[PDB]
Amino acid sequence: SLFKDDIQLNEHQVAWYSKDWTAVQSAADSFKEKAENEFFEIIGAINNKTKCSIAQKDYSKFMVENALSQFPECMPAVYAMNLIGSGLSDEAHFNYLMAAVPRGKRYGKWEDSTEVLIIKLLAKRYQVNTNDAINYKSILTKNGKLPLVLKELKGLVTDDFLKEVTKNVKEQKQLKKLALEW
Amino acid sequence: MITVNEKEHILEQKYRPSTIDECILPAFDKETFKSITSKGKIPHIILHSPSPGTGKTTVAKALCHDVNADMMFVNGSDCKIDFVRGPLTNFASAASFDGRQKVIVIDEFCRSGLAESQRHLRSFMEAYSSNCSIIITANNIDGIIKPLQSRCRVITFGQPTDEDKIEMMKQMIRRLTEICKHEGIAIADMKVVAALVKKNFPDFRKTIGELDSYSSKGVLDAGILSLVTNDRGAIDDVLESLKNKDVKQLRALAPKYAADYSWFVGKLAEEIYSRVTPQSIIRMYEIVGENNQYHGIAANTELHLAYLFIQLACEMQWK
Amino acid sequence: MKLSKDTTALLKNFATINSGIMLKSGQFIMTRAVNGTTYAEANISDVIDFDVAIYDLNGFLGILSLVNDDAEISQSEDGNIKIADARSTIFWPAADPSTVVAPNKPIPFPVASAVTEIKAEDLQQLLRVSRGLQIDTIAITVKEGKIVINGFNKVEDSALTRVKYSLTLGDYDGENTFNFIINMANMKMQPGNYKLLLWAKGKQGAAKFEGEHANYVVALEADSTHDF
Amino acid sequence: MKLSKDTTALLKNFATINSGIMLKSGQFIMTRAVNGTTYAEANISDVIDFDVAIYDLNGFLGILSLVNDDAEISQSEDGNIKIADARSTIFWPAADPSTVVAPNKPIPFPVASAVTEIKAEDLQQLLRVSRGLQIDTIAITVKEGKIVINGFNKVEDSALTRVKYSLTLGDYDGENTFNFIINMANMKMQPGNYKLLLWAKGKQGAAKFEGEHANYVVALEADSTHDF
Amino acid sequence: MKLSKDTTALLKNFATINSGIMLKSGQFIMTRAVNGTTYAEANISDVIDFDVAIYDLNGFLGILSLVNDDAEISQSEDGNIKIADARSTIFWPAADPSTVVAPNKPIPFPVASAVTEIKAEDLQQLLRVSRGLQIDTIAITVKEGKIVINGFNKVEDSALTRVKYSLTLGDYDGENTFNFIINMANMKMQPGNYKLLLWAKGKQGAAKFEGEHANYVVALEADSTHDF
DNA sequence: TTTTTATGTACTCGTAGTGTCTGC
DNA sequence: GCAGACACTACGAGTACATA
Ligand SMILES: Nc1ncnc2c1ncn2[C@@H]1O[C@H](COP(=O)(O)OP(=O)(O)O)[C@@H](O)[C@H]1O
């Protein structure tokens, strides 16, 4: 047993002093801090006139433009970078948007799950597009039992299909959501 | 008087300092190292500076040599997970019959996908830190996970105060003098070495190398001075002709860069961003980015590049 | 001090307990399990000249298996481990004492709160099916007067309430009933059944062996039903 | 023109040195690693009748392990390598010799600065202990008047200070003191008794292993210190 | 219905052709490739009771690889497939028969335009040589009376110019000249003996492999030529 | 005061399953 | 007469990159 009144080394020492590496793996995970990442704060520097100095930060014209796509006052420069900003340097992209966005004071933010599984499930079945799939459901909600076609498609709801739309934790409350359809 | 590694031939490492007192650091940092060596045991230290060649790996080795430590030097890129659990633990748990402090230098540790090995190192520092210590030398400090900086003593290199910079450059001007004394290089003009140290400062590896490249004559006459002060070019002729609105030279420089259009347009945007006024920064990236957008659509690429030159000359308010 | 095959086999077995059992001068060997949940002790044929710490015993014996059996193992001139062979000389590094955990004291066996036994050739046949039919935690209890062993797969049985394999071994002369529930990940015996000696106190409760070669101890489990 | 299984066994060894090989007609074969690290030469029992360069010698023999040993090899009119079997035939493409880094002429090894003589089982034990002690670089030097080999763990040893092995080999009748370092990765010779020839002049150096049919020139390490 | 070892291995083979399979009452199982290039059929010893369609045949066999051989595969009272073990019980969701592309049309092979037989070790050597020689297409023609299989590198060799392997399979009797090219990719038969049946007339054709248990009908590449 | 969208490509690392070789 | 253990491959993960 435990030698009672001896000093117990920390769990790192316990795992490390044992060639049991699965516990050492648990020891390293204790410092993961992946929830404590960074992400942007360059947009805030764009509309605040702050020394961003991106270089190593993850720059995405896809994203950085689409964030200013919500604010219509920043849209003239976003419309330009959409036009001619293709093939323009990342460092140049932030530098153009520096003197291009008006004032700063970074602001707020920027179609549901149980519908979007049916829409994407009808789309793959009949090999149609989103637009066509969306209309299919809307007409099927009105007519010859959409509940019937839900059962026709209970077999091809794989976890690869599911997790592809909303990973998080829903694709398990959605996996066995459309289970009860018989 | 300078430590030489008489098997090196490469200058930039033949005269790599051996001790802290041979290193050129800011006075507080240099004092903080001499005190860390005086206290016997090395703490967990992260030496970092984004500008390379400031003294990181030298000081890391100088601390191990001053203390006379059983140093395990490792290339941080080969410091994978099976390494931290492998030869790292085997060394940390070795018997220190010698009494010298076991210290592991992980050179160039900041890396992309070494995350699992990086957190393992943190958890490793709760077990075997009783025995050994770890010196980290990195360029990007962020490439290092936050738990390590939380534990390690982070000493930022290459960020000196003004008074610290002045004394450091003066020390370096004396170093390159003692290099030229020991290598066989004649210092005909002392303003060469001063401009050598000053032009490329914080990188001490690069300025020693530049002395090697300018030692091709064996003497540092004022001609070599005119070389070091010659601010080179890249595309200095186009920037010059754009500020002067010289339509003749823009007309003759467009066939010069129509060959490598995509590089030149990118290099031109980089250079004008510094030389042009802020209200012109808007029109600059719009004129260039549009010209590059239609690159290849334009039938004559040379004339299209002259079009960029004329468009910039008329629209750029210069500094 | 050459090590024989009996010593190396017990050392190999003691390696399954601690990652690197440090040994002391004499002929007594002991290994507290990394944390403090299993113990082993044994006397063996070969004399120990020096008390050293070992780091990775399994590789150390693996290095020993490359030289002759009568390789004179000495303590190296620099304080490590010299394995003198015919032409070669392997220098196995000595370990730091603070980097491995050994028994601070060879654990005194308390007065047995209960005494029993297993068999003679059932251990080999007992642990064979025990590992085969995926059962973790094992129990020891009195039934029909006799004390028997019968565990449950705590995986598909987090609440301990099943049955898998019984073993009748002998009757229990005592007049009190209990049930201890040792974790499987703690037992690892050499061939040949030994003597099983039980013990229990308030919020403690070990359980150990006595053997022709070694004595093996295990741990308590808080939620164990004690009668003593 | 069939290849005996000892000749191919020697060929699969040469493939460790260089991923390809350029072999001309005759009984003599050779190869050198691209990084000028190792060089092997050997005369063998079979006879090659035609010059051929093989871009992937490893895959060639791995495919040649799929036809019967009586397979008749030849230069097909399909200008490659014809592997005639009892029923099947393999047309392995001959490669442009310019794409195979090979010694254009056999390396005439200079007069040895020091001569010793490793035994096959001594070499065998040296490889077994290296895989157990993570021995990556070894040094052959003088110890109390005898030529010995000492392995280290350059990863943990760095400066190469802590000795981890000592295969006492022959005796040294000269007066010179040398410390030749070889990288274990460049020990691409197959097991077998070898007469070890050492040479080093200034900042140069190489080691040669004379075999009962196969010779090997392995390169010394940057830190090799000698007084020749 | 009980699934034995030989039948699950067949289903493990039929899974490679189609990600799932549709099987109706009887002992005849059949699947076709989604694009329609490889058709496989098999009469088996295990008899299945109901009609079922499995979309994830690969995952179905993986989940079955935990239940004992007594595995009771039954239909659920609602419709799914429950797997009864000696102890545990699993529930697998069945899929609609139109989700799995079924062959549905087991029209018999016509008259064999050419007939030979390939051994088990001959198919073995073809698949093992191609693994080492990167052979992606094989063509079955006649050479000097006996018919052979030639393997090429369609990517490294546009119009199948240079052979890389040739396997003879007996002699041809009639006075016909042809060259049926089969893609090695869409050739998914399991190891064993196969009486090779070759049918082709005009611009259509196919290759049928008659195994001792199952049949594989693959398609011939368009480049194939014949004078039938 | 916010936190994500598609396709295709190339590389590294870790681990885990599979393959070829060897014992006092 | 096979196991062991190194040796090899495949794959999930994570990463960085260039496009529209
Ligand atoms: N603070 C310094 N003092 C003197 N020499 C230096 C200093 N920093 C760099 N050097 C020169 O650069 C080389 C060492 O570069 P180092 O600082 O170790 O690389 P890094 O800084 O990229 O880790 C040495 O040869 C030395 O001559």
Ligand SMILES: [Mg+2]
């Ligand atoms: Mg460095």
